[PDB]
Amino acid sequence: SKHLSAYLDSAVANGPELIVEDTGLCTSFMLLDNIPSAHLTKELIGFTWFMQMYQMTPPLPEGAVNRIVCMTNWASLGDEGRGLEVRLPPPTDSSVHAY
Amino acid sequence: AQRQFFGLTYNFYGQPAPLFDLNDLQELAGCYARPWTSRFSHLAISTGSLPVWSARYPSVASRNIIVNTLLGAHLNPFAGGQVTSHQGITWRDPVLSSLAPVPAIQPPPVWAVAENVPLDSNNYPTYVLNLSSMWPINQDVHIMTMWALSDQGPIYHLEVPVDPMPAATTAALMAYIGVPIAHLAQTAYRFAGQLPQSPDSTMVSTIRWLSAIWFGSLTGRLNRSRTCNGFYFEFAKPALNPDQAVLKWNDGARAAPPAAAQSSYMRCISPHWQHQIVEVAGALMSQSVTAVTGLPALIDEATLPAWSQGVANLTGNGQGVVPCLDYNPVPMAAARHLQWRQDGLITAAQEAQLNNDYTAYALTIERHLTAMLVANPIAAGRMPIQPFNAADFGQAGQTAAAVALAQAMFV
Amino acid sequence: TSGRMIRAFEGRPELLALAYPGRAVLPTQTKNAQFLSTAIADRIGRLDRANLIGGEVSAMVECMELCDALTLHIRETYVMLLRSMHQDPTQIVQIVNECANNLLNSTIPISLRPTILCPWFASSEDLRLQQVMHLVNISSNTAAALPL
Amino acid sequence: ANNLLNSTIPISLRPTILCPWFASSEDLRLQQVMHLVNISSNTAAALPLVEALSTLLRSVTPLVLDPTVLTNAITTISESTTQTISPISEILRLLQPMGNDYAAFWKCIASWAYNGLVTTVLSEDAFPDSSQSITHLPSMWKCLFLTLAGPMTSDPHSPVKVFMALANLLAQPEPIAIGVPGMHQTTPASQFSHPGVWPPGFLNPQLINPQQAPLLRAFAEHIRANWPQPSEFGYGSTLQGSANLFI
Amino acid sequence: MITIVVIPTAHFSWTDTNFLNSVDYRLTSQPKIRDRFAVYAPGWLRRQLDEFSASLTASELLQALQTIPIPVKARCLLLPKPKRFAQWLLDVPSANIWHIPVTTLRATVASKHPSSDVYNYIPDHVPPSAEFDTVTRRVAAGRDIYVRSTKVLGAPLCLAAPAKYYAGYLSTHQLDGVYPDNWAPDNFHKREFCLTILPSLLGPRTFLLDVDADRDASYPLSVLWPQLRVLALKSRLLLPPVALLRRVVDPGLKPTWSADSDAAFRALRLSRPSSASKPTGFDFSALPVVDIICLFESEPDDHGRVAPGTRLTIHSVPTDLLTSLSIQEGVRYPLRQESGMFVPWVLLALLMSDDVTISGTRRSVKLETAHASARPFVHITVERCASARVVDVRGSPAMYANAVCLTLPKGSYKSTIIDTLPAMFSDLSIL
Amino acid sequence: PLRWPGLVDPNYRVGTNDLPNRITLYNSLYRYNFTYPTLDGIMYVRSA
Amino acid sequence: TASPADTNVVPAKDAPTTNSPPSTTSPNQAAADANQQQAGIVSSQSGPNAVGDSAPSTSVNNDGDIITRPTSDSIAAVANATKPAAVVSDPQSM
Amino acid sequence: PFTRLVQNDVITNVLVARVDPAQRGDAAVDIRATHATFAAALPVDPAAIVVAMLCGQTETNLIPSHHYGKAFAPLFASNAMFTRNQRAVITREAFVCARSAVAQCQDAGFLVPRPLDALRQFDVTSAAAAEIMHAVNDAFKTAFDLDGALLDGLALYGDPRIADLSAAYLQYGGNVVREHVPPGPSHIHRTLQQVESTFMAEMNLFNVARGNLYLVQTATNGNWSPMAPVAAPPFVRGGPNVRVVGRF
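YS: structure for the whole thing
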């Protein structure tokens, strides 16, 4: 506030940064692992199967409780981007600061 | 330029008042902004990216339809020479820059409601005196009229000269090769919309050719085998989403010019157009040409709704009258596929398969729309989709004549 | 799958695992498996490609992958905006010639230009708006006029 | 050899003899197209063919190039004073000897045999500035050279380009109308190229009023009347494949 | 041969053995990399720019220079005054290649006022009544040019004749300045890339290098930076320095086809195995520094999850500081000390840096290092080096060996740098 | 499944969504390969 | 006299794309410019002919995509991204 | 053909078609179309040409027969005239074989006999076809010890899935003249077809077996000829109580 700025001829000679291109996934929401699944080894053996056991990255979260959250450009790729983003922690955290 | 236009407001389908909500106005033309070039601001490359599948405006054409109805309540100066108010809203200035609620000190007279009002530019002298700034109104009024004149699909005009394309158009088209139709339609709308132009301008001829080529390829006469000066359109697979087409240029044999100049008016005879982007884009693109050059001739009244019979400066039945043809997409698709087989592009087995796919695709469109209408009965006071009857999906119309025209248009 | 062609992220294999859930391997019937096992076989990869010139980049390509609708709607709108301020060379060269009062007449070659994009233009209203805005951000004394 | 040579070659005829030196016309035609595939649009790999053919031509021709007589004729009529900065300066600048063996001349001749694969064009820098007036003498001499050299090039658009060059210099004194949208009499001549932009007046000189634009009308008629007529002639031997595609 | 036009940054090292190093020293790490680049940027051109800087606007200068081909094959051949110059064509008669009459030559020798006649009608003679662009236009032709003044731009300027004619017509230092041009030429080679300080038409095979730092204010062509940058920006022609290390060029960060995970990218691995017994056993005026992007994180939640955190850019921290402390990329070090203060090495990094900004935008922030902020950071990770270049240090902020006083606001951490840093070594006399 | 009709619904037609009411995660889209030529790349400028 | 070098001239191997520089921005235009410059033609003499042309490049796939490595490696990359362990160790195996 | 001043006969483009456009999968037109002129442009300086025109002289005793006979003799000492024929023939054979190979791999395409169609093969896209053609092209070059291009261009750019080459040029009057170059009678391809046909009957000799594989636990004590069992197969796909595993 009160940042009175004078019009300058050279200042407007920059042009906006219009061309921004992304090669990543066109998505803005992420699936999460909010509560991890337990590793049973003595009793209840077999009730859980981690894809890591087969050296594979699962396509979906495999936690005990999984959430959807908003994390812009989490899968972005190719160049830097606009420089302002929205990232919310899982609801197990406050996440107040975003508002 | 072009110092005059004529127009016609919409028809009420038995309803007593123009069919739009205040929210629709506040949504589609609010913010005190200029509404005169917004027709494409809510369109994109394909239906997959657009919110046309649910809630308000649940159709491709819905927004533009509502826009046309909205204007019908505020174009009084071209009918009675005076600005008026309707439901407490009016223009901000004699230039008709934007809309706003009425002032409390000196309100303008309240508009007396009516339908199918003929419109003349000459009734409002200030328009011509400020033609340079009020030019965009010309395009939109024309577009509204071209839609109001017809039930089912809007009307647009086609023509092909006896001469070859000029080099300028050739160069211009060679730069628009890979562009989808929707983007092309925007440029045409953008071009004629924002400042006066003379009909003897390169872009005008360019867009004129595009509409011709689009129709010729739509009928399937223009293909990879046979093209207009190397250009032709390509349509997407019916197995996934046929509602898409892009421009192409090719080695194929070039079609010969017609023996005499060909021209006619066109419209879609079936309700499918309301939710089919290629129809909307094609119509808007073609209508853009007539907006800048005016109507070449009166439209034949013979096959138009009752209110369109004998509209001054628009429709006629005399000698200087151009006939208007119409078609249904499904029979049109069958004809296009048949031409492909005869040209040898496909086998008979494929042609049968293509017909099955397209018919299945069209069925979904019909199924979606018919369910959408009962969800938005016109008695509710707003018309998001034009009313129709179930039998309207089965009309063959003048499709046979249409392909015959393309036959004569690209020999 | 042999029946489809997909994007090889080729350096972000972990990302590829997320991009195409349909390519999963399902040893045991877990809740994830119960869902993934229902995936349609071919709803993956490149659907259609606009291929114009041999030995030349395809102008655009259509595919399906992990992509939310909302971001899709935004970015499609953004592209639509860019197109709204692009014009073909014939217009561009004509604009320049007219700007110079038809001096320095010039023209363009006639050949295919597949994938050009020149977002360099705006309506008069934009210019009118900017001009007014420019007049608002100055001291209306002589200090404003003198540089002009 | 066009029977410039007569030859004899004795050979014994044994029952079991093999001389694999024959190919059908279809093979040659197929081979020729394959070259087009391999060359693609890469100009760099197309140039050597013209280079080699020109080299052979020079090694073979009996013609001898020597500007000594031309120099003497010029020098006596000119004052040859290291003065007369008027185009005596210019033409001398072009008359003085060149160590390039006039390679440009031979390149044109070679390109004739390979037109459709590579075309010789008048160099862009050779044209006068389209904004320049005819009074600017060096520009006038440039147009003279271009007009003289026109027919040597393989570019089909050379006639139009030659015509437009003069039209440019005569823009002010001879304001004709060019019936091509997007073009003007001041447009650079080298830009025209594509047949679609051939000025209608050039197509039909009767569209130019003699009393209003005498020089331009005469120039067009001169071009349409004196530009050489192409011809053809045979070659090779009927005992071999032809390898020709279009002709 | 793709060309990259380069504009030097604020403290670009010039006397460096290779101009290349001041751009980004990572390019010198591998033989397989350094062999892909040519440099050009000759000294004679540098001197010409230094002179003309005070006499041309940016637009004019750019307009003049932009057309020059990469290796300048032409020369400017200065002519001596007519009385002196005329004698040359008779001292060697065959040198009268324009064949100016003997009578005129000795008439000039006789005249009290030797006229320009000896210059007159000599092709491509440039009189003093000429302009800069006149030279540049002829430079594009590659042939040598004959001039009548020293103030010329675009090509190396050398004497046409032996020095005897120019002596008396010119003075010692003037007669000296042309000596390298008298035998100017050197070859230019066709590698994959060639850097250049000479501008050029930006296009499909020419790129503008973006370093994200202020230009060299003293460098005469820095004024061109805005116009060049905007033209590149509107066509997406900027190149971040990291792109140069890839096998194939592309403008972008985190490309799909490359993970950018290689020893070449890691600027922290500064190595010096080679030697040449050169006098610079070390050049202690040249200092390698880096711009780094670091991620900061707070304590995890009750279930081991952690917030997305924030990443900041630290500018021009000296690299040896990090190397000597065995700092490595991709390692999540603890940030806070036992008493909650920052660990000493982080403080040193901040103190010796130039500026700290948000990674994406260009907003500079003053970092807090106390118990003020809630959810304070406890972990730090360096992610990548945005840039890594050597910089000249000699006499830059301070000028005299006697003493220097530094003013800082109260509460600065001067104690750390003056005590902990020398104590961290305590083996070599620092102060 | 409602988040993924494009992935699992047999009746899913390409080009559909329910954007104003629900966000799907797996959909079809276009990708572009534009080029951004300079002025001289568009037209032959009057050099020198 | 009868120099074979002037008689047996044929296109070299990899002729159509040899001069293409390694880039991703506009490979076809860049390749076209490289050919033009390689052939000894200078832009100031080609004039308008240099602006719109394009030529094949190695950076462009046959399908019409921007490639940065040989296509076999791209096939290899995707193949290697999916290799489940052949023999796994779990307690319940019989 | 040179055209002089007939505007309607001026050529605008010269293009090579790997497939007749009616059969082409997509436009995929020749890259040459992006160029301003239909052929490569070679700028030349008129002044040099003019000089050569104006000063042309001859020797004092020029007998045309003597000069030309002496000049032309060395050229005919070459063998280029025959190597041209030999290379052309080899090119034909390589072309036919290469086209045949790619056609056999894609599920549908140029009409060729398909003796190996029973073998499993995913439908090859354009990129894969380039790999196959590269292999064939390299094989021939190694076999016949050639240098030069041969079939290089087909694989390096454009669609390798070619059908029948043809060249054409377009006139401003809209007329297009097209010339096909179908290959003549090939020899190597004919015998190669025989090789594939007989392989399909003698695959066992190449350490390749046909048919399915059973996995019954047999604990016998007598003879055993797994490569040719005599006992009836335990079951088949349509047999009673036979289950088929799911897709995963």
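YS: worth flagging: The longest helix of chain E spans residues 414-425.
IM: good catch. Also Chain E touches chain A at residues 226-227, 230, 233-234, 236, 251-256, 301-305, 307-308, 358, 360-361 (CB under 8 Å).
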